[PDB]
């Protein structure tokens, strides 16, 4: 079971909003524990049951899975005020902490940011699981050595990171998650800058239709940045699997390390 007891929480600061209402940073006691670092989902229409059952679900989604790098459900409150209890990646969005770090980050833990992204990627695509909404502005950072994809609720269109037969034909495979991989891959060599910026999302449409794509990040290993473009192939059936992503990232992750 994991209902939580109200008590032993302790709701603090504002860190995020979401669809049900505001996300805050806070504390779990345990009864067996010293202090616990948790963020809380909340919900204004929770005393509305289907209110209530389409933000629970959001805590069982995450239930479902287990691994290293996707942020795990702690617990749930589930009466008026509904909540949802999560773990706390302490150092917050990935975007803002590239931003902050652009001088200070060694391009190997950025690449290391990728492989970690790419495994827990491999491990939704071994359960079937198709997410839509890969970007930077999704992926959280527990430490200075360790990212976590974040709340799926919370990162629920992003026409600049998907791909064309998902922007046209509402296609939305492991190919097209590859595809948004691929985007924030990019995104992470850049330190946190967006793709496209300043562009409408109608003209990217055509450009990314035309063979247009992002271009390669200052300092970026060729290498990766030739992995990032076969993530954009347009066929979706020339896209690397996220295992093949894994593997490659590794390689190119060790020669970073040994330059
Ligand atoms: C879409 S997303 O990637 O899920 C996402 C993005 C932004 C905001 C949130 C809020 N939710 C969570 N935030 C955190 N860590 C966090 C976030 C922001 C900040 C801080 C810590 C302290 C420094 C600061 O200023 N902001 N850890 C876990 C979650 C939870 F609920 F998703 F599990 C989620």
Same mark, same amino acid.
């Given at each position: ?33 010293? =202090? ?25 989604? +995450? ?71 890969? =970007? =930077? ?24 990171? +998907? ?21 924030? +891959? ?41 992995? +990032? ?31």
């Amino acid at each position: 079971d994991y209902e939580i007891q109200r008590e032993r929480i302790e709701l603090g600061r504002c860190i995020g909003e979401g669809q049900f209402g505001d996300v805050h940073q806070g504390i779990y006691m345990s009864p067996e524990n010293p =202090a616990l670092a948790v963020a809380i989902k909340t919900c204004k229409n929770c005393t509305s049951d289907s209110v209530r059952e389409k933000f629970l679900q959001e805590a069982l989604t +995450m239930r479902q899975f287990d691994h290293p790098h996707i942020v795990k459900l702690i617990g749930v409150i589930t009466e008026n005020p509904v909540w949802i209890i999560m773990e706390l990646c302490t150092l917050g969005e990935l975007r803002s902490f590239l931003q902050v770090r652009k001088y200070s980050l060694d391009l190997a833990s950025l690449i290391l940011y990728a492989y970690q992204l790419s495994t827990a990627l491999a491990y939704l695509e071994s359960k079937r699981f198709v997410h839509r909404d890969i =970007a =930077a502005r999704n992926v959280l950072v527990s430490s200075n050595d360790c990212v976590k994809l974040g709340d799926f609720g919370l990162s629920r269109l992003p026409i600049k990171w +998907m791909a064309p037969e998902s922007i046209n034909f509402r296609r939305f495979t492991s190919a097209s998650d590859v595809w948004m991989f691929g985007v924030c +891959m990019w995104e992470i060599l850049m330190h946190g800058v967006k793709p496209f910026q300043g562009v409408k999302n109608n003209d990217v449409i055509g450009r990314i239709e035309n063979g247009e794509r992002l271009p390669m990040p200052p300092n970026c290993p060729p290498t990766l940045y030739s992995l +990032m473009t076969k993530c954009w192939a347009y066929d979706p059936s020339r896209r690397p699997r996220f295992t093949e992503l894994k593997a490659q990232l590794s390689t190119i992750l060790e020669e970073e390390k040994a330059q």
